[PDB]
RNA sequence: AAACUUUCAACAACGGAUCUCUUGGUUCUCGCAUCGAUGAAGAACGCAGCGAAAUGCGAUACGUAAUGUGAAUUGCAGAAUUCCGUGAAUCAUCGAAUCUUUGAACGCACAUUGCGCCCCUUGGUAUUCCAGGGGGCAUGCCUGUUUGAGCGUCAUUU
RNA sequence: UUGACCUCAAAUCAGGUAGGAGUACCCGCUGAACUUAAGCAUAUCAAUAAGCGGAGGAAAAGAAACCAACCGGGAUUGCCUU
RNA sequence: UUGGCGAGAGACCGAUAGCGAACAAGUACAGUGAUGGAAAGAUGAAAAGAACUUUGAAAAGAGAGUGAAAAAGUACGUGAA
RNA sequence: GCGGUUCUGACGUGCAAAUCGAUCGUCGAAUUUGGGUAUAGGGGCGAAAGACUAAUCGAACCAUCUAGUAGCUGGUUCCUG
RNA sequence: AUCUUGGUGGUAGUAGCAAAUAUUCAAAUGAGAACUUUGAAGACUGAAGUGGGGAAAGGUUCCACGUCAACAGCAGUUGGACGUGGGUUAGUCGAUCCUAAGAGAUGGGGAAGCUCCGUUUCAAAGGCCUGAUUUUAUGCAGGCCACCAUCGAAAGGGAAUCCGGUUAAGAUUCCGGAACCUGGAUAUGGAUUCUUCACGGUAACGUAACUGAAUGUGGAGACGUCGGCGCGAGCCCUGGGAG
RNA sequence: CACCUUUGCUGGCUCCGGUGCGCUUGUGACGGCCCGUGAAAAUCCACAGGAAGGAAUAGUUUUCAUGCCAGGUCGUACUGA
């Protein structure tokens, strides 16, 4: 009974969507994401899981602000405007 | 070996007391001036079964000395106490069944 | 699932919009190498896992 | 064709607000027409005009506020220079240049001299 | 029948319709459609005719 | 004898080796020092005349402003060809802005698009109710301001 | 009674500051076992991996409570040696 | 100084190699979850990507044509076993 | 309804990684069961079979240390002299 | 190397495609019909259903139009397929509110630290009422009480809606009619008062109303299970009559 | 009666009973059982109390009637084998 018949009883979710990382890893009863560790302040990561670090690091998303910083640094964090 | 049954009890998970239906902890009144120096009279309002416990409990109501209100205590009923009976608690209460001396 | 959360419904709406074959005119673009929609999903084949 | 921000910068607060509304009206009209027609690409020009006018409005309103805090210690964080968090926490030129009277005296008495070997 | 901002409640839709089309609203019913946009069913009062007003805004 | 089986060749299959290619990898060297409460990294949802992605972006949404270049963009449609110009472009540059919902994430919550309170303002007979618009309300710690508490305690005066 | 002082509070008080990310290298803490010893326990692997805290363009160290025993050297770091 | 940014190189690898990833790759897909994690490059100088005819319900065939070559037809260089 | 005795029946590259048929135990409580909730790996939970803990149990699963060690098994690619 | 990845054979047109009683005739459609549609017939589920709805779960599968390369282990003109669109309307149904087992900040105390404990504690832990003042919706006037965040049920607790009609596809949500609850505002009638805050009835209690702060006390919310008996409803059965 | 009419149009009836260890279900008053006596909170009401305010030519009262305004947000298709 442990196999096929028992797979019929699987219709309750142990995990739902995480607000922080978007994965289906928020454990409903522990109120804790198994992937990113929300709502701990720190993001969960381990040096034993390098491949997991690589899936989530800086550069895997949009950057949004951090992509422009090198350009800003190059021009000495200038302030005003270009003259004609 | 594995942790035996008698050691699992202290973690108190499935071994905690089943308290949903209990009336409250049975306890005498707090020992205050009236009880140290005189007596105070309460009424037995109810005599009631407590789940888990053999003995029935007695809901005794006393007036508050310092505020206009009533104060239900929960006593363990002594054999012979009845609803409506007055109970006397304190240094000067008389030697009758149900009184607190 | 009749009585569903908004968050779940919003994800389902996204999935509705993505469920389409490649627009044909993409194939005509210069240096195009996209042949077909390789991320097409179907309710009978693969579940969304929420 | 589209609006041009150099032309808008001549205009007043009220004129710009009025134009903004005329564009928002126009844009709605085209959104309706788009249902009937197959293709309607004029709508791009009027989206971008709206965005132009709002840019100019905001520029005017910000420069007004920059004038209101001219010279004052403390101004809105959004008008303070961005730089980086670490640069904004750094000692100012003044702070970093401070020396104690003891060291100022030594620095005058005994600067590094210019010299050459023959 | 309008598409309407997902942020819009029934109070704001009533007020917008009165303002944009100079018409009196009796009730607003709304739903969020399966594509994630919000549809509003706006019944006018008996003094106005929906077909006239729709012809003015110019979809027939 | 044929069929059949087997072997070899030619042509045809099957399959994707080989050869040639290479906007990718890898290693070494050189130079540089720049993330975030002024809201980062990361997430969600959106945005194009016609896109599902990748890429870009945030209701100003494959972008707005500024500067440079000097006529494209292109799959089609459309627009434009005063294009001898404050001016094309999925161009380069980038100092001004915009920057939904979030996230350290900060009114309280969150398997909820859940529930508050404060200030200004508009509408509904409105200080008190309901609604719209704008702006606010986290914690620890420092300096200071103000208002206080304690027979801890001094003087003075009952 | 009035005013100090000391100590301790409150405020959406005035102005600030910390947190999270990255983490190659750097400063600490904590801390294995596989393995080697032809077995194995001290030992080794290793004052390493994993875990935790904290920085910067470098960090740390640094102007002797130093080395020496010489005819004495003279902050720290790094290389070649030892 | 196996990270970030900007450069220059090699007796290095040449699509089963080299990073997992030359490509919409940390993607598709699996797993309740931590995690796990691919395959997949090459028509031609140019689409000139086969008008037209004919058989067929059609897919397609046969012609005709384009091209230096369809013994290059998108099931696309070569095309082994 | 819950269970699973016997046929040692069907099936045994299955309808199925435990099913099918008949026969059978129990059927108003130490009953059956949904949802919520608690207990987590030398740990849990056990009317006790070393049972059960996501087809995994006399110590789960995932990653890393780790290419762990092997006196043992298997393989180890051209020619002639 | 039971080597690694990829490809390909013989086996072989073979095992097989046999549970759940069952199909048949004609017409239509169409290149093509054992399998589509209509009609006719024959059967089955037999209300503890193969019927009508929902919860979990799925996520567009719903409905229409077009439509057959692949998929539906035969077929296919059909489809839960393929392409393109349409579609989910609420003061009253849910969520939202409440607390349950439980989960969990803060004050504090542990811990090198990630964090752990604990949930009202060895804390200076708040926020209402009323009049005003007519300066204004904050200080002022008074008073009043002080428990201890928060999360935790789409089956527990819980304010309030019904009928008829309507679509390709929605309906206790739309339309028509007819109601109701909560919050707010508010003035007309009625009632009450010169015995100021109603009268009647021996009484149980009656009535259209009929002042009432702090504070306190009660009630409802609010409860097992089985057994027979009574009563209601819907259904079943049955008489007469009108179709 | 209209007539491949928007799809009509007009008229009639839509009534009166019986029965029960019936079925299903609601409910009442009871009875049996326990070393088992079978949630909590929001929320709503009443009472005790007598604070306070209130008349005469005018005062009180919206727990009586009637009347006015508003009710946001998210779910809602379909399957349930
Ligand atoms: K099984
Ligand atoms: K290279
Ligand atoms: K602060
Ligand atoms: K690979
Ligand atoms: K060729
Ligand atoms: K043990
Ligand atoms: K598992
Ligand atoms: K172990
Ligand atoms: K040996
Ligand atoms: K509602
Ligand atoms: K509920
Ligand atoms: K209950
Ligand atoms: K009983
Ligand atoms: Mg198992
Ligand atoms: Mg279950
Ligand atoms: Mg669980
Ligand atoms: Mg997943
Ligand atoms: Mg709705
Ligand atoms: Mg932002
Ligand atoms: Mg302040
Ligand atoms: Mg080793
Ligand atoms: Mg050894
Ligand atoms: Mg050995
Ligand atoms: Mg050994
Ligand atoms: Mg380490
Ligand atoms: Mg730095
Ligand atoms: Mg240096
Ligand atoms: Mg230093
Ligand atoms: Mg010194
Ligand atoms: Mg030295
Ligand atoms: Mg590769
Ligand atoms: Mg050739
Ligand atoms: Mg070829
Ligand atoms: Mg061959
Ligand atoms: Mg059996
Ligand atoms: Mg057998
Ligand atoms: Mg067999
Ligand atoms: Mg045994
Ligand atoms: Mg080896
Ligand atoms: Mg090994
Ligand atoms: Mg056969
Ligand atoms: Mg068979
Ligand atoms: Mg058949
Ligand atoms: Mg039968
Ligand atoms: Mg039958
Ligand atoms: Mg269908
Ligand atoms: Mg078939
Ligand atoms: Mg076929
Ligand atoms: Mg479809
Ligand atoms: Mg309700
Ligand atoms: Mg805790
Ligand atoms: Mg709650
Ligand atoms: Mg309920
Ligand atoms: Mg329906
Ligand atoms: Mg209605
Ligand atoms: Mg029943
Ligand atoms: Mg429905
Ligand atoms: Mg249904
Ligand atoms: Mg059913
Ligand atoms: Zn997460």
Residue reference for tokens 């007055």: B86
Q: In whole angstroms, give the CA distance from residue A40 to residue B52.
A: 42
Strands B57-63 and B70-76, sheet pairing: antiparallel
Tell if A60 CB is < 7 Å from nucleic strand G: no
Q: In whole angstroms, give the CA distance from residue E60 to residue E49.
A: 14
Helix axes D13-36, D42-68, angle to 10 degrees: 160
A67 is in an annotated binding site: no
Chain D CB within 8 Å of residue A79 CB: yes
Q: Which residues are C11's β-sheet partners?
A: none
> Do D84 and A69 lie within an 8 Å CB cutoff?
yes
Residue B18: which residues within 8 A CB-CB, separation 6 or more? B52
Residue D49 contacts residue D23 (beta carbons within 8 Å): yes
Q: In whole angstroms, give the CA distance from residue D42 to residue D31.
A: 10
Residue B27 contacts residue B73 (beta carbons within 8 Å): yes
- Across chain A, the runs of DSSP E, i.e. the strands, are 15-16, 26-27, 32-33
Chain D CB within 8 Å of residue E11 CB: no
Helix (H, G, I), strand (E, B) or coil at B62: strand
Identify the helix (H) or strand (E) that includes residue D8. Answer: helix D5-8
Question: Residues in chain C, how many?
Answer: 50
Q: In whole angstroms, give the CA distance from residue E14 to residue E3.
A: 13
Q: In whole angstroms, give the CA distance from residue A68 to residue D84.
A: 12
Interface of D with E (CB under 8 A): 28-29, 32-33, 35-36
Residue C15: which residues within 8 A CB-CB, separation 6 or more? C41, C48
CA of B4 to C1' of F96 (A): 73
Q: Which residues are B44's β-sheet partners?
A: B60
Q: In whole angstroms, give the CA distance from residue D9 to residue D7.
A: 6
Tell if A72 CB is < 7 Å from nucleic strand H: no
Task: Compute, in angstroms, the gap from residue D8 CA to the centroid of ligand 9.
Answer: 95
Q: How far is D84 from chain A (nearest CA, A)?
A: 9
Task: Compute, in angstroms, the gap from residue D81 CA to the centroid of ligand 26.
Answer: 19
Question: B76: closest CA among B15, B5, B22?
Answer: B22
Helix (H, G, I), strand (E, B) or coil at D53: helix
A58 is in an annotated binding site: no
The count of other CB atoms within 10 Å of the CB of residue D53 is: 22
> Do E34 and C17 lie within an 8 Å CB cutoff?
no
Q: How far is CA D107 from CA D34, D104, D110, in A?
A: 78, 5, 5
């Amino acid at each position: 009974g442990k196999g096929t018949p028992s797979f019929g009883k699987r219709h309750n979710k142990s995990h739902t969507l995480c607000n922080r990382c978007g994965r289906r890893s928020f454990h409903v009863q522990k109120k804790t994401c198994s992937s990113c560790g929300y709502p701990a302040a720190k993001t969960r990561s381990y040096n034993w899981g390098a491949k997991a670090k690589r899936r989530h690091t800086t550069g895997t998303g949009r950057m949004r602000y951090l992509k422009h910083v090198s350009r800003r640094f190059k021009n000495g964090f200038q302030t005003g405007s270009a003259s004609k | 070996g594995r942790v035996i049954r008698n050691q699992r009890k202290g973690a108190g998970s499935i071994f905690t007391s089943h308290t949903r239906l209990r009336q409250g902890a049975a306890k005498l009144r707090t020992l205050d001036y009236a009880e140290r120096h005189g007596y105070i009279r309460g009424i037995v309002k109810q005599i009631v079964h407590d789940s888990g416990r053999g003995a029935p409990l007695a809901k005794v109501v006393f007036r508050d000395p310092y505020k206009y209100r009533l104060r239900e205590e929960i006593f363990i009923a002594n054999e012979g106490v009845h609803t409506g009976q007055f109970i006397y608690a304190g240094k000067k209460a008389s030697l009758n069944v149900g009184n607190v001396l | 699932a009749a009585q569903k959360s908004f968050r779940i419904k919003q994800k389902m709406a996204k999935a509705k919009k993505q469920n389409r074959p490649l627009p044909q005119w993409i194939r005509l673009r210069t240096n195009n190498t996209i042949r077909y929609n390789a991320k097409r999903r179907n309710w009978r084949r693969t579940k969304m896992n929420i | 064709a589209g609006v041009k921000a150099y032309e808008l910068r001549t205009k007043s607060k009220e004129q710009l607000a009025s134009q903004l509304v005329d564009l928002k009206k126009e844009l709605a009209e085209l959104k309706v027409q788009k249902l009937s027609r197959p293709s309607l690409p004029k709508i791009k020009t009027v989206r971008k005009s709206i965005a132009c006018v709002l840019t100019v409005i905001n520029e005017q309103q910000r420069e007004a506020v920059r004038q209101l805090y001219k010279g004052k210690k403390y101004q809105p964080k959004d008008l303070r220079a961005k730089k980086t968090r670490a640069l904004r926490r750094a000692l100012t030129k003044f702070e970093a240049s401070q020396v104690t009277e003891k060291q100022r005296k030594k620095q005058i008495a005994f600067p590094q001299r210019k010299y050459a070997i023959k | 029948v309008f598409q309407v901002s997902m942020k819009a409640n029934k109070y704001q839709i009533k007020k917008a319709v009165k303002e944009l089309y100079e018409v009196d609203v009796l009730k607003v019913n709304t739903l969020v459609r399966p594509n994630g946009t919000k549809k509003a069913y706006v019944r006018l009062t008996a003094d106005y005719d929906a077909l006239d007003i729709a012809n003015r805004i110019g979809y027939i």
